[PDB]
Amino acid sequence: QATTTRLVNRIWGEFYSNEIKWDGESLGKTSAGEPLYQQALVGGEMVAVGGAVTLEVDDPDEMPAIYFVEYMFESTDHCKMLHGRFLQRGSMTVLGNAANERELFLTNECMTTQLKDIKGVASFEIRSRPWGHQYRKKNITADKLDWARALERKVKDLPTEYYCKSLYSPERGGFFSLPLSDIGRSSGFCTSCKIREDEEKRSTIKLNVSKTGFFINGIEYSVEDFVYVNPDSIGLRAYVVCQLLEIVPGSFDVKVRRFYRPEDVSAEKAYASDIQELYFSQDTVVLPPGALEGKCEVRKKSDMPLSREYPISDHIFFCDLFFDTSKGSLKQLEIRLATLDIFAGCGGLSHGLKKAGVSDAKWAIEYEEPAGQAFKQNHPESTVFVDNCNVILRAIMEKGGDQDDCVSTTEANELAAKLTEEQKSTLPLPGQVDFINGGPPCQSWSKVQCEMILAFLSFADYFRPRYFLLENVRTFVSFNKGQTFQLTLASLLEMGYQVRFGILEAGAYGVSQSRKRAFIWAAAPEEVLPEWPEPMHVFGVPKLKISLSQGLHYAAVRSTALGAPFRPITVRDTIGDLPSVENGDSRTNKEYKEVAVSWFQKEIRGNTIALTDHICKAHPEQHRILTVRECARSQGFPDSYEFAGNINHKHRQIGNAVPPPLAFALGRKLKEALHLKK
Numbered sequence: 049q050a051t052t053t054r055l056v057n058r059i060w061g062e063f064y065s066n067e068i069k070w071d072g073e074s075l076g077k078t079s080a081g082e083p084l085y086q087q088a089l090v091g092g093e094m095v096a097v098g099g100a101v102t103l104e105v106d107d108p109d110e111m112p113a114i115y116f117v118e119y120m121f122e123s124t125d126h127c128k129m130l131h132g133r134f135l136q137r138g139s140m141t142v143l144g145n146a147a148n149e150r151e152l153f154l155t156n157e158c159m160t161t162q163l164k165d166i167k168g169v170a171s172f173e174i175r176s177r178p179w180g181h182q183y184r185k186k187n188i189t190a191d192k193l194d195w196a197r198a199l200e201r202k203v204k205d206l207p208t209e210y211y212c213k214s215l216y217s218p219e220r221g222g223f224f225s226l227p228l229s230d231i232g233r234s235s236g237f238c239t240s241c242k243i244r245e246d247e248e249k250r251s252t253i254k255l256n257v258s259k260t261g262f263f264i265n266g267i268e269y270s271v272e273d274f275v276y277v278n279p280d281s282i283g284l285r286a287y288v289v290c291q292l293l294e295i296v297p298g299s300f301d302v303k304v305r306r307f308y309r310p311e312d313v314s315a316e317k318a319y320a321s322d323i324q325e326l327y328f329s330q331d332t333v334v335l336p337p338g339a340l341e342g343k344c345e346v347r348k349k350s351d352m353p354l355s356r357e358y359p360i361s362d363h364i365f366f367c368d369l370f371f372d373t374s375k376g377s378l379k380q381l382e383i384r385l386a387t388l389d390i391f392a393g394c395g396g397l398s399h400g401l402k403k404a405g406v407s408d409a410k411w412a413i414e415y416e417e418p419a420g421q422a423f424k425q426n427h428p429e430s431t432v433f434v435d436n437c438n439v440i441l442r443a444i445m446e447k448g449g450d451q452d453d454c455v456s457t458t459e460a461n462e463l464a465a466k467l468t469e470e471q472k473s474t475l476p477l478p479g480q481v482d483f484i485n486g487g488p489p490c491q492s493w494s495k496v497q498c499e500m501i502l503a504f505l506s507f508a509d510y511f512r513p514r515y516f517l518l519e520n521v522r523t524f525v526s527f528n529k530g531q532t533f534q535l536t537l538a539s540l541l542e543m544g545y546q547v548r549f550g551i552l553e554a555g556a557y558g559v560s561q562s563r564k565r566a567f568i569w570a571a572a573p574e575e576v577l578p579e580w581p582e583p584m585h586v587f588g589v590p591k592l593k594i595s596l597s598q599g600l601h602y603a604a605v606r607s608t609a610l611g612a613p614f615r616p617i618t619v620r621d622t623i624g625d626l627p628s629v630e631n632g633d634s635r636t637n638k639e640y641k642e643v644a645v646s647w648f649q650k651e652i653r654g655n656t657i658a659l660t661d662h663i664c665k666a667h668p669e670q671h672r673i674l675t676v677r678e679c680a681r682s683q684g685f686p687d688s689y690e691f692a693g694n695i696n697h698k699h700r701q702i703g704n705a706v707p708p709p710l711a712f713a714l715g716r717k718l719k720e721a722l723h724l725k726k
């Protein structure tokens with residue numbers, strides 16, 4: 049019941065069916081003076097820079113490993129050394145059983161060994177297909193050829209042939225573009241080895257002889273600077289902000305001053321105060337240099353960026369007053385991309401992306417009328433298509449003259465035949481979309497090929513956008529024993545993408561409700577993959593762990609339970625300002641009763657004066673359930689947002705949306721990635 053292209057259907061169905069010498073002269077010498085060579089002959093086989101060799105290791109049942117050579121040289125001992133980077137097999141990576149048999153992945157670990165211990169030379173090549181939708185058809189033809197010859201080698205029992213496409217980084221959990229310009233140089237300077245030695249050099253305390261500054265965790269810590277200190281170190285809260293006063297005689301300790309946050313005095317004091325408020329103190333304490341977690345900046349109330357964004361992304365505080373703990377009271381002293389939001393919903397994600405300045409929703413797809421109406425009301429310029437995705441994809445396939453490249457049922461064709469001329473003419477075309485985002489719903493192969501999934505994959509395959517965003521609930525990496533996640537990664541890699549995945553928590557970005565969302569980024573090989581945003585608010589949630597292969601694990605972002613630069617947001621900061629109502633109220637347009645007091649209410653009330661959607665069905669103090677506007681505030685929806693349909697449709701839109709601050713942070717990261725362009 050799902051219209052999918054040939055490639056995705058084929059992949060999913062295939063998965064679900066079940067004497068030593070040198071050559072030439074030396075080219076130069078290494079740093080130590082050892083002459084390096086280029087070509088060698090051993091046992092009738094030829095070894096050259098850029099090839100792949102096999103080594104001998106224990107467990108003879110496992111077939112020998114593959115090493116991509118980097119450089120070979122001759123030492124004064126008169127031996128023959130060769131240095132090679134490991135080529136990880138696809139079956140041992142996160143993909144698992146769904147990985148390609150002939151696929152290898154580059155790694156960052158390299159080792160040197162004697163040449164006499166190699167088993168032999170294996171064929172190896174690197175493929176760099178041009179990127180674009182127009183070449184797409186041609187590509188599959190080549191793939192068909194790749195299906196034949198190798199199969200012939202299976203019949204003739206010839207040795208297999210491998211290839212490499214992308215570099216695997218389990219520490220970042222991503223497949224990235226091969227650094228071609230920094231590989232295969234044959235100069236004795238391995239980039240991975242230099243990176244590893246630089247990393248090993250760091251993470252060690254540097255005892256600077258100058259009594260002005262030092263180095264910690266690869267950062268420079270100077271005198272008269274503001275630092276963060278873990279409250280547990282000081283004999284859930286935020287980072288204790290201090291000022292580095294002096295260093296006294298793993299050999300020096302730091303004596304620092306102190307600042308007191310408004311939440312320390314009383315809850316009510318912070319309930320009516322800013323988020324960058326601090327109090328001076330005369331308390332000085334001595335700590336080891338390993339208790340510092342970052343750098344802050346405390347400024348005056350005379351020069352500010354005047355960009356009061358939400359959520360806050362820069363570490364900056366201010367303090368113009370004094371304090372005294374003894375008394376107990378404080379005293380005075382060109383890049384926007386056209387996008388298509390499949391499964392648009394109420395439009396929260398699209399609103400956040402557009403607010404971030406990287407997206408403008410020129411198209412959308414919706415299943416239910418009220419959600420499409422809400423999207424149209426909030427996004428007037430978005431051409432919302434209120435219909436099922438199968439018929440819409442079939443229509444664009446027919447318009448593009450590729451009706452033979454889609455597995456569509458009769459119902460999809462007959463429903464697509466009823467579209468008018470205007471609807472057909474307003475459809476997009478390949479080459480006009482540079483961004484595709486949306487989260488498909490989630491819920492022997494014949495019963496799984498009708499799932500709402502693979503529709504997004506077919507859309508991405510047909511359009512081939514520059515960037516690709518996918519999102520689901522936190523259990524997307526555990527559905528069907530994780531098979532669907534592996535298959536999605538395999539399909540995205542087969543298309544020729546750089547992909548990455550990560551679990552994010554919405555409770556550490558300015559939202560009072562905890563929510564875990566799994567995101568997958570994909571990009572073209574010529575573009576830079578965006579980085580994950582950094583949390584700034586504390587929340588009682590452990591590290592976000594994704595189960596990889598070989599027992600390894602990867603975390604998208606650092607934990608925030610230990611501390612964060614900003615205090616958490618509670619319930620009173622969200623719904624403590626709206627006027628009270630009675631049970632079963634059914635009035636839409638009201639007026640505000642009280643002025644904004646808390647920081648969150650001040651930020652979210654904006655300039656509007658007309659309260660809307662304060663409707664509840666038939667709360668710690670009132671004997672009634674939360675209203676629609678209360679839920680919208682709890683999810684970070686600004687009051688200016690508009691809805692549609694009845695109350696049940698509004699609640700369903702609320703419960704299936706994405707917090708706008710999270711989308712804003714992701715869009716800011718994407719904007720940074722776009723600006724950081726080669």
Ligand SMILES: Nc1ncnc2c1ncn2[C@@H]1O[C@H](CSCC[C@H](N)C(=O)O)[C@@H](O)[C@H]1O
Pocket residue numbers: 390391392393394395396397398413414415416419435436437438486487488489500704705706
């Ligand atoms: N076949 C289909 N085509 C389009 N939308 C569909 C669909 N099946 C379900 N939907 C809708 O897709 C939504 C799933 S949740 C998606 C929310 C959206 N990403 C947002 O940011 O708000 C629901 O509104 C659901 O009704």
Ligand SMILES: [Zn+2]
Pocket residue numbers: 131158159237238239240241242
């Ligand atoms: Zn090296």
